[PDB]
């Protein structure tokens with residue numbers, strides 16, 4: 001059955017709750033973003049109203065084949081009414097089309113659901129600042145002080161300069177970027193832009209990108225692999241074996257590969273700075289691990305919550321074990337005691 005952390009009290013709404021069949025009482029199903037854990041259970045067979053951003057609606061329509069009659073896209077930063085309740089969608093700074101939802105309940109309670117997010121100080125001057133928020137449903141992916149990472153911009157600058165130098169040194173080098181869902185598109189778009197190239201990719205991946213309302217997209221991406229010096233492959237192929245194999249397929253148009261694996265956090269965030277990063281190398285193929293995150297670091301999450309000052313916090317990630325919930329409760333109390341709410 002549908003957990004309490006996916007229900008919004010005093011409405012018949014749910015959020016990211018598609019895997020439990022018909023939820024009793026639910027009149028509107030919200031979807032924060034198009035990642036499989038969150039959409040799990042949605043298909044052409046779903047017949048209830050789904051509320052979401054325009055981008056998320058394009059993906060539902062085209063990738064999952066959800067029938068158009070059930071897709072209710074809403075604009076961002078706009079007060080809307082859904083089944084008699086006022087709502088607002090805000091940018092989550094996660095993957096394309098990802099939203100936070102603000103629910104104004106009829107009793108006067110205000111609830112923020114973050115979905116998946118990467119907290120940023122620009123969220124402190126949105127519509128959130130206009131009134132008190134009583135309850136927060138929080139993306140707690142990285143809720144522990146060891147989880148630090150550089151900014152997106154530091155990582156992109158590093159990627160840019162690395163690729164530019166490698167291809168100026170050897171103009172027959174190919175650049176490859178690994179991927180498994182939407183998100184982290186700036187990695188490959190920024191590398192391509194400094195190399196004067198489009199990004200080449202499979203038909204399924206191109207179809208995905210074509211749904212994302214990216215300006216001038218037709219000038220940036222192609223299905224013609226041969227005409228392009230940056231290629232996208234599945235993350236699973238980003239290894240020496242997979243990369244040698246792809247290099248055989250390109251027809252001796254390239255004689256070297258430089259590949260990037262954008263990851264989340266791994267244990268080497270604790271010492272290394274981005275400027276110290278060195279690749280793994282076997283022969284004419286180099287692989288760089290780069291920690292480009294679309295979730296809040298501990299410090300970014302703490303700052304956001306300490307600003308917002310919610311009366312109650314409901315975690316939405318790592319809630320499956322008592323040990324994790326207990327640990328998270330401890331950090332929420334520290335934050336409250338330090339800031340005085």
Ligand code: NI
Pocket residue numbers: 033035094116
């Ligand atoms: Ni996500």
